[PDB]
Amino acid sequence: DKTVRWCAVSEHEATKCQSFRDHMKSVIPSDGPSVACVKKASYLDCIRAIAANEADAVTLDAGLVYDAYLAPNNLKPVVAEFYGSKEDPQTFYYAVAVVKKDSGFQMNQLRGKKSCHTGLGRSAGWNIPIGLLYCDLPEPRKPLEKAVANFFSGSCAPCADGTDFPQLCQLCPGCGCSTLNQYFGYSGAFKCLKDGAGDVAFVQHSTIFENLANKADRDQYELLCLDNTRKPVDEYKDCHLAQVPSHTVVARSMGGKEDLIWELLNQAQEHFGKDKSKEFQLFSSPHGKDLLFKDSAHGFLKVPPRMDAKMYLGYEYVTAIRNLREGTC
């Protein structure tokens, strides 16, 4: 029982959140957990708000789960999204690089091309691809933003500082950090490629399938494999850049309401999970893609007792992030 203040990032998420609240109100008893919606402009404002007791929960891509864990925020992962299916839940997804058919370049010929990223610091859209190209970048590789801006001939890196690194917002002026920026996120990064602004989009394996319904339209795209070859989009399992951890809901380490967060999400998935309700869907929305939770998620899994971000993420992934911040070739 009682309220969970969910942090919505911008307008579209705020709208889905209010629908969430209302529908949960009609199915959950008076003694059940309720939702309240707190709208912020960016995920970073959501992280600050939770730490300052202005909100209670927000779902974050795993690369951002690390930042949320750092002081003075010290948030912890409490609920994880899972993909694939209820039968065989997967707590990871594949980072891939999508390109247009016959564009004529491999992974080792990315210098000078234009890039579309889901957002600064995110797993598939930034951490994995930039981590793999780190040494191909020109010195000085610090700050990272500068070297990336000089490697590509223009990008859209949402949440980056367009004032200090204008090239990173060339494809999306402002580098807006929310769905108000049409090239934000997985589907936004794909749109950036589809529209012709960029040459490559760093997204997840399911992104193209969530955006292109005809095999004929998808046959116009390919994936860049690490062996400097290209494969069709259905072959991501044999052509991906890395496997990364699921997006996860984070909460305060003190007075965090993790029990209510789990109670709310568990009930929510039972009533409004995949193919559960015709009235409301937790994992899709007429208002946008990946609002509050990823459209590709099938449900939630509780994170084990008192697990910190580092253990949750794993040594390899946390290493990759570290080596990206300081890193020596």
Interface residues toward Fe ion, by CB under 5 A:
61, 123
Q: Which residues are 7's β-sheet partners?
A: 38
Residue closest to Fe ion when measured from CB atoms: 61
Helices in the chain by DSSP H: which ranges?
A: 10-27, 43-51, 62-69, 128-133, 144-151, 185-194, 207-211, 215-218, 258-272, 309-313, 315-325
User: Cβ of residue 299: shortest distance to Fe ion, in angstroms?
Assistant: 17
Helix (H, G, I), strand (E, B) or coil at 223: strand
Known binding residue 247? Answer is: yes
User: Cβ of residue 33: shortest distance to Fe ion, in angstroms?
Assistant: 26
| Nearer CB in complex with Fe ion: 24/68 | 68
Contact 41, 91 (CB under 8 A): no
User: Cβ of residue 127: shortest distance to Fe ion, in angstroms?
Assistant: 9
| Nearer CB in complex with Fe ion: 91/229 | 91
User: Cβ of residue 9: shortest distance to Fe ion, in angstroms?
Assistant: 14
Known binding residue 61? Answer is: yes
Contact 156, 189 (CB under 8 A): yes
Known binding residue 122? Answer is: yes
Closest CA to 128 of 326, 323, 329: 323
Known binding residue 31? Answer is: no
Known binding residue 22? Answer is: no
User: Cβ of residue 244: shortest distance to Fe ion, in angstroms?
Assistant: 7
| Nearer CB in complex with Fe ion: 170/296 | 296
Six token digits for residue 113: 């091309």
| Nearer CB in complex with Fe ion: 55/65 | 65
Sequence-separated (6 or more) residues with CB below 8 Å from residue 26:
none
CA separation for the pair 295, 133 (Å, rounded): 29
- Cα separation of the two ends of the chain: 52
| Nearer CB in complex with Fe ion: 5/298 | 298
Known binding residue 93? Answer is: yes
User: Cβ of residue 242: shortest distance to Fe ion, in angstroms?
Assistant: 12
Six token digits for residue 251: 């909460």
Helices in 52-140 by DSSP H: which ranges?
A: 62-69, 128-133
- Burial of 94 per CB tally in 10 Å (0-12, 13-18, 19+): buried
| Nearer CB in complex with Fe ion: 28/320 | 320
For the annotated binding site, the residues are 61, 93, 118, 122, 124-125, 186, 247
For the annotated binding site for hydrogencarbonate, the residues are 118, 122, 124-125
For the annotated binding site for Fe(3+), the residues are 61, 93, 186, 247
